[PDB]
Amino acid sequence: YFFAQTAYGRILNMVNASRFGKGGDPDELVPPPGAQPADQYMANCIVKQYKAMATPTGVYTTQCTEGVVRGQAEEARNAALSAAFRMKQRSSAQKFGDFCESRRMAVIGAHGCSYEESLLTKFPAAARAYTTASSEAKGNCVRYADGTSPAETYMAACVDKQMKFRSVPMGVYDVLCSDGNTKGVAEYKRVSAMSVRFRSNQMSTLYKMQAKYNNAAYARNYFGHGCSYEENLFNKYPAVSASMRPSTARY
Amino acid sequence: MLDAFSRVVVNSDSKAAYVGGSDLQSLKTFISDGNKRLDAVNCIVSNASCIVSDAISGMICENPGLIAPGGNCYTNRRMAACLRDGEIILRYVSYALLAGDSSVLDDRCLNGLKETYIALGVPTASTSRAVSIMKAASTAFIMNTASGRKIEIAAGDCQALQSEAAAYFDKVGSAVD
Amino acid sequence: MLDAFSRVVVNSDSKAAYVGGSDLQSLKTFISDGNKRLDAVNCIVSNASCIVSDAISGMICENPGLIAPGGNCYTNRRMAACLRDGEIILRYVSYALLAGDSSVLDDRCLNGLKETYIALGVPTASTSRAVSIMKAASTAFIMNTASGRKIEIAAGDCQALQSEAAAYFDKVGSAVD
Amino acid sequence: MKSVITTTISAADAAGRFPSSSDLESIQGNIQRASARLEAAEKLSGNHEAVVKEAGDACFAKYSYLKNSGEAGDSQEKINKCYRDVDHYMRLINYSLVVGGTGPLDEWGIAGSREVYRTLNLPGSAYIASFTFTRDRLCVPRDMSSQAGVEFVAALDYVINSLS
Amino acid sequence: MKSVITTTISAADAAGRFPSSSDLESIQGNIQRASARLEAAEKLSGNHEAVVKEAGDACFAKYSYLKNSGEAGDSQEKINKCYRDVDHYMRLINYSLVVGGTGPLDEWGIAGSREVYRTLNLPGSAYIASFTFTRDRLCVPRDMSSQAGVEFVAALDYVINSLS
Amino acid sequence: MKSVITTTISAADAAGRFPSSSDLESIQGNIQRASARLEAAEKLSGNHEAVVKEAGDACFAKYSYLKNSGEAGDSQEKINKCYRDVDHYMRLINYSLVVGGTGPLDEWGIAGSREVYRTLNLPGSAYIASFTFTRDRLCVPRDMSSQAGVEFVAALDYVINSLS
Amino acid sequence: MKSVITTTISAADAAGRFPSSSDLESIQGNIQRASARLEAAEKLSGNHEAVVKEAGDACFAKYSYLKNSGEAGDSQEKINKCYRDVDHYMRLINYSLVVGGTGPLDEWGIAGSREVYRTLNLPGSAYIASFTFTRDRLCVPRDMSSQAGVEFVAALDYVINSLS
């Protein structure tokens, strides 16, 4: 009000009133002015370093593969980019909500250090790619470590349903529900999902055991605070602990 | 992933000694037989869909029960998965021809697959038949005795290597049963 | 990721014609100069921490303000990251020596790095100094004129390749400023 | 764009390590087989136009129903598109033949070709008739070399196993 | 275990592609440089024991303080562990020299060695003194070959750059 | 297997909610359009064999080069495989016509058909010639009904847009 | 906002496919049951204010302790908040009644209501007393219609199963 009576503040009211209505990304505005490309290359350095931490030798691991068969990696990249543009598609409030959960998860992930907290709270894509690539490199994710005993497979199915609750609010599916965007790549996502579940058996038994204890430590540190019965499920069952995702995903 | 080299080195590691003369001599036979192995891999590579089509189509033509409704080749998607698995077996057999040791094939693809085909209901006799047809087709391509493709190479004996590829296919087909 | 081959192919693709005689002739000069490039890459590889330690320690010894509290070499963590970044710069320069084209180096590492080091507060003059010391050290190893290591190779002129590696380091150090 | 250089450099890059002796042996092999590759590339750039003419006129030596309705024979324009597309394929066999891997032939020609072919009603078997013609029209001692012809066969068979 | 074979096969395996011409060129290079590698391996398996003696006795020709307190010189047993560990390193240079990458030397010797060395208070610079001795004790025309020696130097320098 | 029932129940299942009024309106619509669907299913199950004969003989009324070499015309057996495969397609149009979605037609016929067709050298345009024949051979007031005919057209056009 | 249209469009959107016949049957059902929905919406927008008065006065016909302390009866203002909130609920039954799913009723009224009601010490059983009154105060043949009344009961019972 007090600007409008001033001759100078009639400018400020119009600039602020022009700025007020429109939505934006947290990638756009959360960093300091002129530091978004630094965040893109920041996040690229992160994911490249975890890709270094997965394979310490020149041999690619059985998991570090895109296509099982000819002509499948081209369908994997063509499926991969529509997910990224679809990340751009969504509404603003969802973007900042997913951003703040990315912040909290990145902070739990750091387990210490100022730079880890400062660079992950300052820089948005650094936080997202940090969490995804870190949980991805430890093997803490859905596609790996599927349950052996029938009880654990059922429990994992129940967790999968209760995350599908997040990935559909109110009957209407998400933006991010993305099996298609094409003619018939949904069957390719079936094929690739089934085959990745086949390839988790192909790994070394050392990486199987490390994957199990990593799964348990994951589901404790991020999602279990107190939670003594959930502590017991994260004790005993690695398949339950292997597939809990930050609700930034909505996959 | 272990080739011929890595098999010699691992066996020398269990023996805990250095490499020595005899093992290196057998590996010199590998290097002198290298170019035959190279041309052999070229022959088995340049007939992908050809070997796979003939093998699996011959597998259905032998036993027509698979394409009967209630079979395993009956769904169109199941038939694509069928062709894809045959292509994958052929793929890692070709890798076993480059490597000279079946460690990539045993630790890659032959691992877990018996319990998987039991877990899906794929009949093992039909798979062993398809692997056998890929075996005969692959030996006929590797000796350049194909009935419609006859490619120029300077002649020589390559029987040993043919028995090697036959040992890989007999490893897979023996493993699925 | 484009080598000298891919640069010739891409230039012929923009020209939309076939490859021809002259471009292949310059690439024949590359293949005849191949073994010199190979031994040169071996020389720069077999002195990793040697060149990195001398380069960065020389960078601190030139400007002692970095080691002052408030500087960027001051914290241990910062010094480890310092050594790591110097190792990485040397690493992609070595990739640019194998490839013969700086596409790996430009699209991998050199892109966005000025705005990143501005986004962190790393001074650009110190980085350019360290890259320059890696340049001179790398040329002195690449001409086998090191005062600390003199390894036997068959003698010959390698001046053009030295100007090439100097062009890569001057590309990076010119790019960070 | 896949070659020996990009495979080994990309592998050591994902590893994080400097290039050890194995990568050096790989590029040693590239500059061993380079002579046969560039010989075939020189002779292909020599008489490509006759391969154009016999290729497309061989494709219309087989299946005639292209020039029947409304499949593709309905103009000088679609037959020109026919020839120039085959020239794109031979120009990619030249490119991948220079490079020494299946890189540019796959990333420029093979990647996503299948949807374009089912979409624009193009049968692949016509292309396969053209390429099986151009690999059957070889000559062992006079055309390239014992080694060089083999490399050409390899690239062309790759195209066939990509399309069928 | 990294070699040319395992690198290219693993790369094309992750790709999903059959082995195309590029991998074939790479293994062609492996069987080109094979002769220099196996020559050096033969001579190493020949006189390894003298390399043991001169290696370790050169390491105790330098730093005396190992045989001083309570660092490591307090028995013939610790000095025997000293020698046998250097023999493990030369036996890995034999293994990696046969293989033709830094594969078995890295995955058996170098991987996780650092925690063992800081944990068991073993100084790395003593090993580096030993190896820099054994690479300075070469000979160009009489010991191996110009090509062969170089391969040996590569592997040994790699151990040095792994430890320092 | 997609229908109205499975879509709405699967949607409310992923929601977790009980099936509210909207799903009930959806299944209300299914039992409204049921009469036209089942009429077309009854008449298809009536004279399917004449659709078999005119379908396949229409496909060999067009392209003759199937019965030329070695593409597919080489026996009574391949022509029998021809007819029975078209009967699988009409049996799926019957199945999906009863169900009322494209469910069983897609999950039994369309899913992964393309790789089988490019792999076993089958041209799709011959099937499309067969189906465009069988949708051109309609009759408005005498054959089924205005509503039933339309539903049949829809299913068949779906097959065409699945294959091309 | 959930309806038949948004559910089937969102389902086919997540699938990727064009809208096939199943979705068309679903929206066909929506425009079949449309008449009963809009009849009930018209009559609700007719006499809503009397439903407001009997609704809230029925809620204070039961539990009296709201107008006792300091729970909520402490002004004409809190009783006005009482009535206007009930009017928000009936206006959402109008909205969801027009839409034909529980969409706007859930996303405007039900989602996150619970935290606001435990937080601001609001009892939900008071609202449930109000709604059970307003569904007991119907009339089958004279108030709306056999179809309309049922639909109104459905919406109102949904609110009750959302709140209890």
Ligand SMILES: C=CC1=C(C)[C@@H](Cc2[nH]c(/C=C3N=C(/C=C4\NC(=O)[C@H](C)[C@H]4CC)C(C)=C\3CCC(=O)O)c(CCC(=O)O)c2C)NC1=O
């Ligand atoms: C782009 C942003 C970006 C980051 C923020 C970092 C984050 C990060 N740190 C590490 C890795 C590490 N980070 C630390 C740091 C710590 N030491 C401690 O005593 C403290 C708890 C903490 C400092 C406050 C350590 C010690 C490691 C190595 C851990 C190990 O190997 O045990 C790794 C794995 C790869 C590696 O080993 O370097 C990554 C991705 N990396 C990035 O690319």
Ligand SMILES: C=CC1=C(C)[C@@H](Cc2[nH]c(/C=C3N=C(/C=C4\NC(=O)[C@H](C)[C@H]4CC)C(C)=C\3CCC(=O)O)c(CCC(=O)O)c2C)NC1=O
């Ligand atoms: C098959 C095994 C299996 C489990 C073990 C659980 C684990 C689990 N708990 C929650 C979810 C939850 N779990 C708790 C529990 C807690 N409340 C606290 O005060 C304590 C810290 C802790 C009990 C000791 C809470 C409060 C939520 C809801 C969290 C929220 O929405 O804020 C969720 C997300 C879905 C949901 O909201 O229900 C899951 C998967 N679910 C499963 O399917």
Ligand SMILES: C=CC1=C(C)[C@@H](Cc2[nH]c(/C=C3N=C(/C=C4\NC(=O)[C@H](C)[C@H]4CC)C(C)=C\3CCC(=O)O)c(CCC(=O)O)c2C)NC1=O
């Ligand atoms: C990388 C290695 C690798 C494998 C070893 C296979 C293994 C494999 N096969 C199938 C799945 C399948 N595999 C086949 C194959 C056939 N069944 C038959 O009865 C025929 C005899 C046989 C063809 C010769 C079939 C038909 C299916 C699908 C149905 C089934 O389980 O049988 C699946 C489930 C996913 C899917 O449906 O595709 C997996 C993981 N997949 C891989 O990616």
Ligand SMILES: C=CC1=C(C)[C@@H](Cc2[nH]c(/C=C3N=C(/C=C4\NC(=O)[C@H](C)[C@H]4CC)C(C)=C\3CCC(=O)O)c(CCC(=O)O)c2C)NC1=O
């Ligand atoms: C990098 C890839 C790569 C290859 C694919 C091979 C290709 C290759 N093969 C031979 C050469 C040959 N290749 C074969 C092979 C055979 N002949 C027969 O009649 C059988 C059908 C077949 C069994 C395998 C024979 C017999 C020779 C000649 C004999 C010999 O050189 O040992 C040569 C010698 C030079 C020349 O002939 O011009 C080369 C380079 N080498 C490589 O470096």
Ligand SMILES: C=CC1=C(C)[C@@H](Cc2[nH]c(/C=C3N=C(/C=C4\NC(=O)[C@H](C)[C@H]4CC)C(C)=C\3CCC(=O)O)c(CCC(=O)O)c2C)NC1=O
């Ligand atoms: C693959 C390419 C690649 C790069 C180009 C670097 C780039 C890079 N450097 C740092 C981070 C850093 N980089 C340096 C380096 C130094 N700072 C100084 O003042 C010295 C002059 C200089 C050493 C010579 C330091 C000290 C940090 C940590 C603090 C800082 O931001 O300066 C970070 C943040 C993560 C971390 O802390 O490690 C990144 C992404 N990292 C990579 O992975």
Ligand SMILES: C=CC1=C(C)[C@@H](Cc2[nH]c(/C=C3N=C(/C=C4\NC(=O)[C@H](C)[C@H]4CC)C(C)=C\3CCC(=O)O)c(CCC(=O)O)c2C)NC1=O
């Ligand atoms: C697999 C690993 C591998 C290598 C590491 C190289 C090693 C190598 N270098 C040369 C050969 C050579 N190497 C150099 C290199 C140089 N000489 C100088 O005085 C400069 C200091 C230095 C600049 C780089 C020169 C000049 C020759 C001889 C000229 C030539 O062959 O082109 C040769 C030819 C054969 C011989 O000399 O016996 C070989 C095999 N090649 C390989 O295959």
Ligand SMILES: C=CC1=C(C)[C@@H](Cc2[nH]c(/C=C3N=C(/C=C4\NC(=O)[C@H](C)[C@H]4CC)C(C)=C\3CCC(=O)O)c(CCC(=O)O)c2C)NC1=O
């Ligand atoms: C740059 C690559 C390149 C090729 C791949 C060839 C391909 C090629 N060959 C011929 C043409 C020919 N190619 C051959 C070769 C032979 N026919 C036989 O029956 C023998 C088996 C075989 C020798 C071993 C012959 C004889 C002709 C002329 C007649 C014919 O078509 O067969 C022609 C037509 C022009 C002409 O007559 O020369 C072309 C384009 N030309 C090229 O420039």
Ligand SMILES: C=CC1=C(C)[C@@H](Cc2[nH]c(/C=C3N=C(/C=C4\NC(=O)[C@H](C)[C@H]4CC)C(C)=C\3CCC(=O)O)c(CCC(=O)O)c2C)NC1=O
């Ligand atoms: C496969 C490769 C391979 C190696 C290279 C060795 C490396 C190695 N050395 C030791 C262990 C040891 N290594 C030494 C050797 C040393 N004594 C000194 O005076 C010198 C500094 C140095 C010789 C140059 C000693 C003394 C120990 C025992 C240390 C101790 O117990 O205090 C250990 C711990 C287990 C043990 O006690 O044996 C290991 C893993 N072991 C392997 O499996």
Ligand SMILES: C=CC1=C(C)[C@@H](Cc2[nH]c(/C=C3N=C(/C=C4\NC(=O)[C@H](C)[C@H]4CC)C(C)=C\3CCC(=O)O)c(CCC(=O)O)c2C)NC1=O
């Ligand atoms: C497996 C690899 C391997 C090597 C690389 C050598 C290394 C080596 N050289 C010598 C031993 C020797 N090496 C040389 C060589 C030299 N003469 C000079 O004028 C030059 C400085 C230098 C050549 C460039 C000489 C002269 C001796 C004998 C030294 C002496 O007895 O005085 C010895 C001691 C045993 C012996 O007497 O042979 C060893 C281990 N041996 C191996 O087993």
Ligand SMILES: C=CC1=C(C)[C@@H](Cc2[nH]c(/C=C3N=C(/C=C4\NC(=O)[C@H](C)[C@H]4CC)C(C)=C\3CCC(=O)O)c(CCC(=O)O)c2C)NC1=O
């Ligand atoms: C459930 C549904 C269902 C179908 C629709 C079919 C589809 C189908 N057809 C074939 C296979 C075949 N289909 C045909 C048919 C053709 N012959 C031609 O001349 C025409 C182009 C065409 C008839 C119009 C032929 C010839 C084969 C064998 C192809 C060959 O082996 O070369 C195959 C591979 C297995 C086999 O050999 O039988 C499959 C899955 N199968 C099913 O399970």
Ligand SMILES: C=CC1=C(C)[C@@H](Cc2[nH]c(/C=C3N=C(/C=C4\NC(=O)[C@H](C)[C@H]4CC)C(C)=C\3CCC(=O)O)c(CCC(=O)O)c2C)NC1=O
């Ligand atoms: C928007 C929704 C909506 C409703 C559901 C109705 C509900 C309703 N009904 C009445 C009013 C009435 N409702 C009935 C109906 C009944 N007669 C009987 O014999 C049976 C018990 C019962 C039918 C099953 C009667 C008789 C009255 C008048 C009561 C009276 O005046 O005595 C009134 C008071 C105003 C009036 O007189 O119309 C209201 C609000 N009105 C609405 O606005």
Ligand SMILES: CCC1=C(C)/C(=C\C2=NC(=C\c3[nH]c(CC4NC(=O)C(C)=C4CC)c(C)c3CCC(=O)O)/C(CCC(=O)O)=C2C)NC1=O
């Ligand atoms: C840490 C780096 C790393 C990565 C990125 C990796 C594999 C990998 N995961 C990939 C994909 C991928 N990775 C993730 C990460 C992830 N996020 C999760 O919440 C869970 C449970 C995940 C599984 C690891 C998702 C959601 C996807 C989406 C599925 C898709 O896009 O098809 C890809 C890209 C293409 C593909 O293969 O489909 C790759 C190459 N393996 C690794 O070690």
Ligand SMILES: CCC1=C(C)[C@@H](CC2=N/C(=C\c3[nH]c(C[C@@H]4NC(=O)C(C)=C4CC)c(C)c3CCC(=O)O)C(CCC(=O)O)=C2C)NC1=O
């Ligand atoms: C009527 C239903 C029917 C078929 C379909 C075939 C399928 C078939 N191909 C075989 C085997 C076979 N198939 C081929 C491949 C094939 N031949 C070539 O020369 C080229 C270019 C090919 C791809 C186009 C080869 C090379 C062989 C090995 C025999 C030979 O030397 O030809 C075998 C023998 C299997 C065995 O040895 O156990 C069979 C059964 N047979 C049938 O009864």
Ligand SMILES: CCC1=C(C)[C@@H](CC2=N/C(=C\c3[nH]c(C[C@@H]4NC(=O)C(C)=C4CC)c(C)c3CCC(=O)O)C(CCC(=O)O)=C2C)NC1=O
């Ligand atoms: C007191 C603070 C301080 C340092 C730290 C050094 C750092 C240093 N090294 C140089 C340059 C340099 N450094 C080395 C590498 C180095 N030499 C070897 O023989 C071996 C084995 C090495 C690693 C252990 C080489 C090979 C050169 C090139 C000059 C030469 O021929 O030695 C140069 C010259 C830069 C230029 O030419 O522009 C400098 C400034 N200088 C200082 O004032």
